[PDB]
Amino acid sequence: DAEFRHDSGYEVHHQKLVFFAGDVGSNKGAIIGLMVGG
Amino acid sequence: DAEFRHDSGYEVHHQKLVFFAGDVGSNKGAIIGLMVGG
Amino acid sequence: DAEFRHDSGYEVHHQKLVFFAGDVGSNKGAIIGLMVGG
Amino acid sequence: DAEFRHDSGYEVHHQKLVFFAGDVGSNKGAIIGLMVGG
Amino acid sequence: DAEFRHDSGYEVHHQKLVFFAGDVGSNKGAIIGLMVGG
Amino acid sequence: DAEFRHDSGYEVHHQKLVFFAGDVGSNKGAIIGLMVGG
Amino acid sequence: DAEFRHDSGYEVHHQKLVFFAGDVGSNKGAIIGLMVGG
Amino acid sequence: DAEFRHDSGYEVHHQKLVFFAGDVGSNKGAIIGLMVGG
Amino acid sequence: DAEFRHDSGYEVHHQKLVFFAGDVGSNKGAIIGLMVGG
Amino acid sequence: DAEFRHDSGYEVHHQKLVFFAGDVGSNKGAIIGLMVGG
């Protein structure tokens, strides 16, 4: 007579002027805010 | 008669002018705010 | 008759002008705020 | 006259009988290999 | 006269009997190999 | 008749003008605030 | 006349009978190999 | 009839103009505030 | 005339019967190999 | 005319029957090999 209960909790996010909001599992590419050449 | 209860807690985030908000599992790429060349 | 209870706690974050807010499991890439060459 | 060169390197992975192979940016859910109740 | 070159590298993966092969950006759901109740 | 209770505590963070706010499990890459060459 | 060169190195991984192979940026959920109740 | 209770305590952090706020498990890479060459 | 060169080195990992192989940036959840109740 | 060269060195790891192989930046959760109650 087992009982398995899981709750992921309450998440509230307030964000302003955020370039990258989020979780990246794996990153091998390029993440650049601004690129100026020449 | 076991009882398994898990709670991930309450998360509140307030962020302003944040380039990268988030959790990266693994990072092998490039994360640059600004790139100026020449 | 065991009881397993886990709570991840209450997390409140207030951040302003933060380049990188977050937890990195493993970092082998480059994390640079600003790159100027030439 | 700047030169920006980035290389993410050579990655070779050999895995056998691995439940979870991969990078998780953020984890708030449940990751259980086996669940038995009652 | 800037030059921007990015290479994500060579990735070779050999996997056998792997339940979950891949990168998860964010996980709030349930990932269970086997569930047995009653 | 055992009882297992775990609480991760209350975490409050106030941060302003912080380049890198977060916990790094392992760091082999480069973390530079500003790079000027030439 | 600056030159920016980054290399993430050579990574070789050989793993057998590994429950969780990978880097987790942030973990607030439950990671259990086996759960038995009742 | 054992009782296991763990509490991680109350953590309050106030930080301003902090380059690196956080705990590093292992560091083999470079952490430099400012790099000027030439 | 500056030259910036970074190398993350050569990493070889051989692992057998390892529950958790990987780097965790921050851990607030539960990581248990085996849970038996009742 | 400066030259910046960084090398993270050669890392070879051989591990067998290791519960937790890896570097944890910050730990506030529970890491238990085996939990038996009742």
Residue numbers in the entry:
A (entry chain I), B (entry chain G), C (entry chain E), D (entry chain H), E (entry chain J), F (entry chain C), ...: 1 to 38
Paper text:
Amyloid plaques composed of Aβ fibrils are a hallmark of Alzheimer’s disease (AD). Mutations identified in familial forms of AD (FAD) indicate a causal role for the amyloid precursor protein (APP) and presenilin (PSEN1/PSEN2) genes, which encode the precursor of Aβ and the ɣ-secretase enzyme that catalyses the final step of Aβ peptide production, respectively. ɣ-Secretase produces Aβ peptides that vary in length, of which Aβ1-40 and Aβ1-42 are most abundant. To determine the molecular architecture of pathology within fresh, intact tissue we developed a cryoCLEM workflow that we applied to 11-14 month-old AppNL-G-F mice. These animals have a humanised mouse App gene containing three familial Alzheimer’s disease mutations (Swedish, Beyruthian, and Arctic). In contrast, the Artic mutation is situated within the Aβ peptide coding sequence (App E693G, Aβ E22G) and is thought to increase the generation of Aβ protofibrils.
To rule out the possibility that MX04 altered the structure of the in-tissue fibrils, we also determined the structure of fibrils purified from MX04-injected AppNL-G-F mice using single particle cryoEM, revealing a structure that was indistinguishable from unlabelled β-amyloid. The backbone conformation of the Aβ peptides were arranged as two ‘S’-shaped protofilaments that form an extensive inter-protofilament interface. The ordered core of each protofilament contains residues 1-38, compared to residues 9–42 in type I and II wild-type Aβ1-4213. In both type I and II fibrils formed from wild-type Aβ1-42, E22 is surface exposed. However, in Arctic Aβ1-42 fibrils, which only differ in the E22G mutation, G22 is buried within the fibril structure, at a point near the intra and inter-protofilament interfaces. Thus, it appears likely that wild-type Aβ would be unable to adopt this Arctic Aβ amyloid fold because of steric clashes created by a Glu at position 22. Alignment of available Aβ1-42 structures from post-mortem human AD brains, and the two distinct Aβ amyloid structures from AppNL-F and AppNL-G-F mice, indicated that residues 20-36 form a very similar structure in each fibril (1.35 Å and 1.31 Å Cα RMSD AppNL-G-F with Type I and Type II fibrils, respectively). This conserved structural motif adopts different positions with respect to the fibril axis and the interface between symmetry-related protofilaments, giving rise to the different amyloid structures observed.
